[PDB]
């Protein structure tokens, strides 16, 4: 009856969107998906084989709510608490390559286009399927 992204649980929504990106096997996952650490503040690599789709799903969801975000804004969004061991913790940003490639991969799907000032924003095609996936996320809930 009319469902957009901001009407459904975002935890479920990212899971569903990641599966859709996985099922439509066009996203360009890089070769270094399984050997890198997502951020210098992390100790271990992700406990998930196809985490790239989940990160890509999260980014597209994020670009829907705040358009114009570039790589640095992605690192800020995915930044976290670096436990420096015996010294006190601080805030550490995410990986720039990981963010840049997630952005670059979404352009191949024609879901994300570079913004005029800078950063990237969602194509109407990229906005249509997110609202569509939100529809089935809502559809599962009421069922």
């Amino acid at each position: 009856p009319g469902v957009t992204v901001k009407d459904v649980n975002q935890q479920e929504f990212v899971r569903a969107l990641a599966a859709f990106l996985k099922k439509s096997g066009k996203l360009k996952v890089p070769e270094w998906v399984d050997t890198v650490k997502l951020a210098k503040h992390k100790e271990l690599a992700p406990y998930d084989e196809n985490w790239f789709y989940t990160r890509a799903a999260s980014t597209a969801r994020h670009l829907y709510l705040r358009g114009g975000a570039g790589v640095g804004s992605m690192t800020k969004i995915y930044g976290g608490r670096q436990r420096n061991g015996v010294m006190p913790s601080h805030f550490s940003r995410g990986s720039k390559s990981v963010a840049r490639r997630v952005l670059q991969a979404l352009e191949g799907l024609k879901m994300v286009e570079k913004d005029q000032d800078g950063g990237r924003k969602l194509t109407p095609q990229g906005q249509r399927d997110l609202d569509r996936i939100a529809g089935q996320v809502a559809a599962a809930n009421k069922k």
Binding site: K6, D7, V8, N9
Partner: protein, 141 residues
């Protein structure tokens, strides 16, 4: 040309402004349904005004909230204070004062903070101590 009241609820530095306009029972916070505002652990807090007054009093009005500043818990309290103050102000300006009284006293007799703001703020830090009152450890020998 429409029945509309903008009323603001507050908690610490979290400001939540509720646009209460003549509608059909649509309540949304920052463009999200009221049941989708985290953390759901304090969700009954957001649902307090609706639960105590019922759906029928919210039926003929649509509320949209813009929330800024503060933290997750303060944002929830301010949001619930705005929805309470709005259904009171809306019933005050357009509906009669008689009915506006019962929606007010019922809210107050349950929780005073639904209508009346909490004046508490962070006390300033004073030198010679980590915080407002605590002082650094004193060593004598």
């Amino acid at each position: 040309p429409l029945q509309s009241v903008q009323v603001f609820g507050r908690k610490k530095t979290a400001t939540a402004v509720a646009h209460c306009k003549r509608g059909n029972g649509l309540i949304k916070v920052n463009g999200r349904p009221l049941e989708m505002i985290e953390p759901r652990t304090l969700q009954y807090k957001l649902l307090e005004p609706v639960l105590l007054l019922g759906k029928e009093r919210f039926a003929g009005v649509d509320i949209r909230v813009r929330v800024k500043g503060g933290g997750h818990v303060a944002q929830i309290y301010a949001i619930r204070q705005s929805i309470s103050k709005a259904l009171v102000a809306y019933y005050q300006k357009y509906v009669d004062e008689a009915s506006k009284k019962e929606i007010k006293d019922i809210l107050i007799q349950y929780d005073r903070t639904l209508l009346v703001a909490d004046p508490r703020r962070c006390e300033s830090k004073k030198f010679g101590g980590p915080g407002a009152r605590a002082r650094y450890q004193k060593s004598y020998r």
